[PDB]
């Protein structure tokens, strides 16, 4: 019947009717029909033939005769026993048909091999068996499709193959995993924290110790914190006990700091002494962080920093005492001996007094622990509690812990959270926000449940916002956040930081919702909207940012002008352009009062370059002339003597390249924290943020 | 929704078509409409206020000269002189013998755009155009080249001196519109041919002068030179006579590429006759040998024209098939035709 000149259907499924009886025949009757041209039922006979060559376990012929089929191979004869039987026989028998040369030619994702192993791999992954050809064959294209929806935190594991197959294995796995919340870069964030990623992390360069120069030396000297060089220190078995010389970031920050002097640098005598003729500026604000990042390390201006700030004026002590420990700690360790002495030395009774130096050792820490600085910070803050109290300093303390270690065993959250009783809803916004978010990255799902129950109790009716924000912080880009915005309170700050942090992915893909929340959102929330430009914009800010915010810039609203020029802000300072410098004109010609004007223009100055120059490269005279001419106005209006130092914070700071921070895909913790408070900028919150 | 039923009332029902004169940073823009009407209009709607630019059409609501939106409307004659289209049927495969002549310029037009890999990876990049020339009256023979380039990418042909010195100029400003509009449609190609701006003598209508034709050619150079336009708009130039053309052109562009048009040889002549007689049915006694030997230095459209008159007298006899005798006498009409003139 199969060869009847008539084209009449059907030669499919008819083998099930009479089955054993035709098995008394063979393919010999079939071959003259399929091989002879100008004959009827050429590929239709393969619908019956795929079952005879399939039940005989033959392989690549079921492949060869399923080519035009594309359909029946799915549903084919049921009892599962012959199906997983000839499925594993066909399985182990089709890969032996593959890579027979040897060493490729590789298949040869095609609609024959990959669509058939996908087709039957449907029923494979449905109920019975496991470990199909995907582990047998070696195709990563089908390995993309080998996996089924499951939590991937466990999927960091694979069959160990040769580093040859491990390299492109890891490349195709990587590009498979980028869309996905979790990436092979997870070794940084996670937590985890087990010794496995340090073992395999120093084994990826094992055993060659010469060409290991990259990914090892750059990794130990590019590390500000101690954890990677620590766990990895125990996981770096090159030599013995003398690898610690390339560790601890002493010779690290020394070498890279002298290569930064190789690629710098910033002016010292001219600007700073010509400014020393001007005695003290009226800002009492941004001038200290100059000598912080600039010098680094020198002592002489450190005793001017100190001896001055002994006067205690305002918070001006801030960037000064920040240069106290940042100077010597530029390489190592340092100053953490006398760094924290002014803490107890100076009841605070507030942050600007004894809390400044109390911030010092915590932020200047950058990898300590070590482990003394941990218990020293916890101890020194447990000394001063009612005078802290819950508010002004508790903002900055967790930044001395969570930075260095997320999975740190010490809980300073509980001991700092016993002070919550003051009941003030206001200061606990910006206080408890990064107070509770800045202790740890956690990842246990338990922590925010604890602190939600013991904190709330009840509830604060306010902080709960920031607490689900802290939860949504704890996990990273799990895609759980788009499910966490469904609340979308009248407060609506859930949605802004929820979309801000809630998606970390290379492809934006967040334009639909990021625009849908501003187009659908209630009034004045669009003020909060541009603040999400911090995270997702790391890829391509040039097109969209000055586009959107260019419309938000000339808006008379100082709030969306402020939060706009910040919205661009640092992520818009990555690179420069003629549009920026040309746009700076008439941004500074506006007649409006208030700090928003020179935050707009003067922050818009720092977007021309970051820690680059001046010698080498771009001239400093043009900045001198711009900040010199714009300051002719007001006349004071002391904010002009605040702006002239403002641009040269980042301008003449240098000595650090960012880049981003960072290239490794971490994030700066002081920047998001601090930039959340001055959104309602009032008095000293801008200088707290001016720690930077 | 409600905004569509709102802004229409303000801008409705009538509104004048205005012209933006200049912009004041107040959001007030000095506008102009017939006649001598200036004004200040601050609106936040439909704008797009950045991209407006002076010298463009802005709507003007009668109360009072308010702009509800902007409408960019062209048309324009020069946009009509670009297309359409032709997407012509004539491939470079329909012409023969110049395979080596063409293969380079064929590259330089298809080396960028199509197939950029070698070109962009090589870091060389010569997309400054080309230059052509050839005797005695060819050049559209090289429009049998550019006619293949008309089969890809984007194209506008502007050829002849007439479109330059026609009336009193205004000098290059027509050439300015060509360059800038071909930059607006970029990528594109502008084909110039037979530049007689110096070769032509009489000023059309009342016009002057020879040096102002030389200075409009000069600004043609500077706008092609150029300071500073990376837009492409590639430029293909051709002519009969390379003598009167000034070297000031060549060093800016085209500095790298210019082709020479040779006259066809025996096998090229024969090839072309086969090309044109491919369609036409000819009698069994038609021979190409005595043709290509008797004729001297004829290009494609010459023997194509003898095919045309051969079919003309073939229609005078109402024969679908041309006879070799009538091909030799009908030919003799063009032979004698070039011998008569």
């Amino acid at each position: 019947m199969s060869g009847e000149v008539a084209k009449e259907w059907q030669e499919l499924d008819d083998a099930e009717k009479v089955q054993r009886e035709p098995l008394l025949t063979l393919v010999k009757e079939i071959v003259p029909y399929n091989m002879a041209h100008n004959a009827e039922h050429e590929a239709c006979d393969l619908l019956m033939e795929i079952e005879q060559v399939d039940m005989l376990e033959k392989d690549i012929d079921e492949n060869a005769y399923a080519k035009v089929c594309l359909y029946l191979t799915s549903c084919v004869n049921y009892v599962p026993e012959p199906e997983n039987s000839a499925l594993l026989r066909c399985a182990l028998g089709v890969f032996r048909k593959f890579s027979r040369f040897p060493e490729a030619l590789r298949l040869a994702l095609m609609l024959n091999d990959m669509e058939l192993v996908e087709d039957i791999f449907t029923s494979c992954k449905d109920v019975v068996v496991q470990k199909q050809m995907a582990f047998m064959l070696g195709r990563h294209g089908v390995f993309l499709e080998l996996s089924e929806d499951v939590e991937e935190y466990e999927d960091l594991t694979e069959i160990m193959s040769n580093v040859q197959l491990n390299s492109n294995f890891l490349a195709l796995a990587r590009e498979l995993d980028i869309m996905e919340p979790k990436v092979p870069d997870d070794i940084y964030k996670t937590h985890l924290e087990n010794n496995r990623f340090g073992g395999s992390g120093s084994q990826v360069d094992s055993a060659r110790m010469n060409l290991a120069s990259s990914f090892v030396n750059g990794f130990v000297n590019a590390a500000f914190g101690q954890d990677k060089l620590l766990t990895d220190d125990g996981n770096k078995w090159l030599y013995k006990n003398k690898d610690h010389g390339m560790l601890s970031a002493a010779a690290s920050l020394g070498m890279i700091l002298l290569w930064d002097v190789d690629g710098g640098l910033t002016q010292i005598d001219k600007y700073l002494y010509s400014s020393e003729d001007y005695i003290k500026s009226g800002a009492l604000l941004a001038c200290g962080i100059v000598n912080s990042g600039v010098r680094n390390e020198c002592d002489p201006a450190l005793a001017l920093l100190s001896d001055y700030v002994l006067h205690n004026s305002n918070t001006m002590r801030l960037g000064s005492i920040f240069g106290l420990g940042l100077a010597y700690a530029g390489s190592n360790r340092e100053d953490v001996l006398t760094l924290l002495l002014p803490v107890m030395g100076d009841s605070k009774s507030s942050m600007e007094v004894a809390g400044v130096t109390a911030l010092a050792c915590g932020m200047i820490a950058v990898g300590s622990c070590n482990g003394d600085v941990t218990s020293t910070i916890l101890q020194t803050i447990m000394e001063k509690s009612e005078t802290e109290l819950k508010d002004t300093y508790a903002r900055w303390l967790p930044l001395g812990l969570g930075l260095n270690h997320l999975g740190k065993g010490e809980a300073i959250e509980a001991i700092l959270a016993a002070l919550e009783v003051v009941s003030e809803p206001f200061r606990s916004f910006a206080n408890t926000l990064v107070d509770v978010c800045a202790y740890a990255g956690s990842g246990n799902v338990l922590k925010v449940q604890q602190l939600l129950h013991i904190c709330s109790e009840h509830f604060d009716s306010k902080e709960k916002e920031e607490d689900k924000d802290k939860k949504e912080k704890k996990d990273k880009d799990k895609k759980e956040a788009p499910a966490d915005m469904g609340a979308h309170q009248g407060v609506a700050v859930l949605g802004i930081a929820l979309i801000a942090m809630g998606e970390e992915i290379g492809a934006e893909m967040a334009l639909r919702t990021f625009g849908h929340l501003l187009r659908y959102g209630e009034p004045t929330l669009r003020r909060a909207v541009p603040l999400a430009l911090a995270l997702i914009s790391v890829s391509n800010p040039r097109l969209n940012i000055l586009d959107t915010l260019s419309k938000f810039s000339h808006d008379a609203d100082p709030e969306v002008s402020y939060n706009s020029i910040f919205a661009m802000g640092m992520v818009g300072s990555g690179t420069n352009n003629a549009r920026l410098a040309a746009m700076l004109r008439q941004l500074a010609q506006y007649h409006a009062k208030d700090p928003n004007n020179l935050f707009m223009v003067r922050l818009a100055q720092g977007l021309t370059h970051l820690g680059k120059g001046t010698l080498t490269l771009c001239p400093y005279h043009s900045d001198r002339q711009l900040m010199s001419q714009v300051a002719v106005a007001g006349l004071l209006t002391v904010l002009v003597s605040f702006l002239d130092v403002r641009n040269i914070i980042l301008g003449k700071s240098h000595y650090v390249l960012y880049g981003l921070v960072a290239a490794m895909q971490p994030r700066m913790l002081v920047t998001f924290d601090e930039e959340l408070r001055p959104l309602p900028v009032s008095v000293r919150v801008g200088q707290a943020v001016d720690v930077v | 929704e409600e905004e569509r039923s709102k802004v229409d009332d303000l801008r409705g029902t009538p509104m004048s078509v205005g012209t933006l004169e200049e912009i004041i940073d107040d959001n007030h823009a000095i506008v102009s409409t017939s006649v001598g009407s200036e004004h200040y209009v601050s609106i936040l709607s439909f704008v797009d206020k950045d991209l407006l630019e002076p010298g463009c059409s802005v709507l003007l609501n009668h109360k009072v000269h308010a702009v509800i939106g902007v409408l960019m409307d062209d048309t324009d004659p020069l946009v009509t002189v670009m297309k359409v289209e032709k997407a012509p049927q004539e491939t470079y495969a329909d012409i023969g013998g110049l395979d080596n002549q063409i293969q380079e310029i064929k590259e330089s037009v298809e080396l960028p755009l199509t197939h950029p890999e070698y070109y962009e990876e090589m870091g060389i990049k010569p997309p400054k155009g080309v230059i052509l020339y050839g005797p005695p009256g060819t050049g559209k023979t090289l429009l049998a080249k550019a006619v293949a380039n008309q089969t890809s990418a984007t194209f506008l042909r502007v050829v002849g001196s007439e479109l330059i010195q026609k009336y009193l100029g205004d000098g290059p400003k027509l050439v300015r519109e060509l360059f800038r509009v071909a930059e607006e449609h970029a990528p594109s190609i502008v084909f110039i041919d037979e530049i007689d701006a110096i070769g032509t003598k009489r000023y059309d209508s009342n016009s002057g002068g020879e040096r102002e034709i030389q200075r409009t050619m000069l600004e043609l150079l500077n706008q092609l030179d150029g300071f500073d336009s990376r837009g492409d708009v590639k430029v293909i130039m051709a002519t009969n006579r390379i003598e009167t053309l000034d070297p000031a052109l060549i060093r800016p562009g085209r500095i790298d590429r210019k082709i020479e048009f040779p006259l066809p040889d025996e096998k090229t002549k024969k090839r072309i006759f086969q090309i044109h007689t491919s369609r036409m049915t000819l009698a069994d006694d038609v021979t190409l040998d005595d043709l290509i030997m008797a004729k001297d230095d004829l290009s494609g459209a010459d023997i194509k024209a003898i095919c045309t008159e051969a079919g003309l007298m073939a229609l005078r006899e109402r024969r679908m098939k041309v006879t070799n005798e009538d091909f030799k006498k009908s030919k003799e009409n063009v032979l004698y035709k070039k011998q008569e003139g």
């Binding site: 849908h516 669009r526 | 802004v7």
Partner: peptide, 15 residues
Amino acid sequence: APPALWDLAADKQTL
């Protein structure tokens, strides 16, 4: 469309 929504919604203060 969202930017044009807020763009056309400022005509109430504009008038």
